Symmetry: C3
Subunit: 333 residues, 3 copies
């Protein structure tokens, strides 16, 4: 394979490495490195801990962006400081269990996989070492996404280009943290020590936490998502194990690929869309009003009580035609 090589410097979510939408480049070999990190992290404002397993140190793993017909060459590294075997399965890829059957590496090893990006869209990638380890590694955080853009950029299915001003990647994680007898969340010294209790809970299918970007409140405050009135924002949403129903409170999905695949035209003007577990989807919105927005899964129990709320802080001029407080709160006549 004698194509040009291009290195990408990955960046942590919710940001996305610089890329072109429409491009005049032809196919390349695009080189990525992912280094697995097992680590104990804090997942909520109460200080609950969690035995995480990650690509590149983050939940989700970083978004990889290429174009249709590129070859994606990933160096997967499992440092000796980890305890378990790991691999990678790309839903964008064809053959060998998405790459999983060619990438199983023990601590101290690395492997190099190349796959041709023949399918456009956003896709999950995740670890899948075999058997009961598959769900455990995924719900411990070992999942991310890849975006395979058409070379001509995105379109509306009616001949018109859809160009985003910025893209964010929201990875949603269902987490299963067991409780002790008195009802407090348990802490564990290693992923292996967490496994028995965590699997017992997993099989009951109810998460303790549902978070964006690895933690309750990760995408709020200093780390709120941002936009300006007039900006078209693409929001890629993934969930490797469990369904989600994204909703932008105060906005819409102007153009939505809920199954996440750009060979299909987007749907228009959605209130809430649906990310099937094991997939990524994408929604574009042009902001029309300034202020705070919440971006949630619209199981509101999950959103408000289990962790699944992000914010956008949007700058610009208020549009009284679109919405106005005609009369402020006042005593009932």
């Amino acid at each position: 394979l004698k194509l040009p090589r291009q290195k990408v410097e990955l960046v942590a979510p919710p940001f996305v490495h610089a890329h072109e939408q429409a491009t005049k480049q032809g196919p390349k070999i695009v080189e990525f490195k992912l280094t697995i990190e097992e680590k104990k992290v804090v997942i909520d404002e109460k200080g609950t801990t969690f035995q995480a397993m990650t690509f590149n140190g983050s939940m989700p793993g970083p978004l990889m962006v290429v174009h249709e017909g590129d070859y994606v060459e990933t160096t997967l590294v499992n440092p000796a400081t980890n305890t378990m075997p790991h691999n990678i399965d790309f839903h964008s890829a064809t053959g060998a269990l998405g790459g999983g059957a060619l990438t199983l590496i023990n601590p101290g090893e690395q492997v190099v996989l190349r796959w041709k990006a023949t399918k456009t869209g956003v896709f999950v990638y995740h670890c899948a070492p075999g058997g009961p380890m598959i769900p455990w590694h995924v719900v411990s955080g070992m999942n991310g996404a890849v975006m395979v853009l058409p070379r001509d950029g995105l379109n509306d299915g009616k001949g018109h280009a859809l160009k985003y001003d910025k893209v964010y990647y929201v990875g949603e994680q269902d987490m299963y943290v067991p409780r002790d007898e008195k009802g407090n969340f348990k802490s564990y010294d290693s992923p292996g020590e967490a496994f028995t209790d965590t699997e017992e809970m997993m099989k009951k299918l109810i998460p303790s936490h549902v978070v964006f970007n690895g933690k309750v409140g990760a995408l709020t405050g200093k780390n709120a998502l941002t936009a300006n009135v007039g900006e078209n924002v693409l929001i890629v949403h993934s969930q490797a194990n469990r369904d989600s129903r994204p909703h932008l409170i105060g906005g819409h999905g102007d153009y939505v690929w809920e199954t996440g695949k750009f060979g299909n035209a987007p749907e228009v003007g959605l209130e809430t869309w649906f990310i099937r577990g094991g997939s990524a989807g994408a929604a574009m919105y042009k902001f029309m009003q300034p202020g705070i927005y919440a971006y949630v899964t619209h199981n509101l129990i999950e959103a408000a009580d289990l962790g699944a709320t992000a914010h956008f802080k949007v700058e610009g001029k208020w549009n009284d035609d679109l919405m106005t407080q005609v009369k402020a709160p006042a005593e009932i006549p």
Copy 2:
């Protein structure tokens, strides 16, 4: 804003206030009033009670119907006989958390919000006072829907009008009623007294009841939905917090907008469709056979055991070409 004003007299679900489909009217300011009522209600045939919180006294709140480009001016009233603050978030609206950030009212107050109906479809509206109160108020019953029709009425995406003879609004409600030690449903003296136990249950994500129109059996018997053979019926279905999968037993969805948005063409000939939690969808069916139909969510446990069954009673002539009992039950030869 110097447009004509038009008042609407809302009606309780499953009925829908009189409206035009295609219209020659231009944009108007359409005026609605919603008065919040907190009240203890009975939700099943066993006499289980429930601390409900409602718009206009009903679960769901009434369906509001306007056309694209209208301005919707809602007077939201929170009488002093209630105990909690409330607000309203319209998924149809743009800005200020759907209106929620402009409509928080204490008992004894009212507020007037106007929003421009720039997106067509059926949409959820719900209370969303902030934080953990958001899911609690929604699952206590504070949700309804609005329908924003194209000015030319509905179409099939192929150039042809789709005119309904009647429309019904089915609001589905997941309810979380705690049990005592011996396994009976608990009763509470106030919503505030119900909150701690109810939140603990909510976070476990399994409802005790799933009902249409506020109660097991609400849309059966005297209150069955009705039609005649030959009539095209539009069924709007909403679920503000949790997924549903509507199905008309003995029928189909001839034309279905499962994501609920009229900028998209309907799907045709469905058996079962999917309402993502936090959304409304709509399905049209032309009845071809008389008799009893059941309209359910097709988790049949929810439908038959947790409350989520409505009936249609349909008049007209049986069509033996479409279906016939060739041989009645008889002993096996």
Copy 3:
């Protein structure tokens, strides 16, 4: 009704009785027989038993295949060796609760129902005897599917034929097996004896097992699904009671009707699709690589831990352009 009659010899899933895709036949009366069998079966590799109730002895019931405009004439037989009344509801059919209101038969009886196949797609059929028996009979295994093909075969919505080389039917079953105090699965002497404990569990909405073709591992080993590189395989997936999210690990859904209805164009290039509870869907894939594939629901806990994994074993030549192991596992430099 003076049309030609054609008998079909049904075959057990995942296989499908021989049929034409495009056909020059006109409408016929197509005759099927289903004989109900209640039986205790083993559902996992641990030897857990289950009080099953089945059409034709299998879970799922066999796939019935006809063409648009055919009349489907089913002899439903409830032998005296069974204990309960049963019936059949076809989601493909119009009127009388899908046929259920015309087919209730006691042990020792049979009935003959005819329905006209006016809607194309794949559809669920299931037992539905009334009230709380409806979910119980369905989750005990009394569900299958029917496929109603266009007379011109399948198409891509763009004018082009889609011809499958083979079709498989994957019926997914949520099962509710109670546990005793010490945590072992219970065994029962009859379906009636299992009912009280099984209903109590059903209402909590969490299955103990989620299986394909009636058992953990049913579609693995000797009984793996098969294909060759170059073959277009249609996979019909049904779930009569609960949502599923199919995914072919290492492949895609080239053409997918996730709502399962051929009046709608397929979506293209999916990673994971969604089968709403109470429906069947269908996905076509042309295999490009040899080796083992897993076909799962992509709640990976369900797939790996509760039973919901099938395999494909695919023969042919490996395509290094699509995927290659550039560097095998090696020590990190």
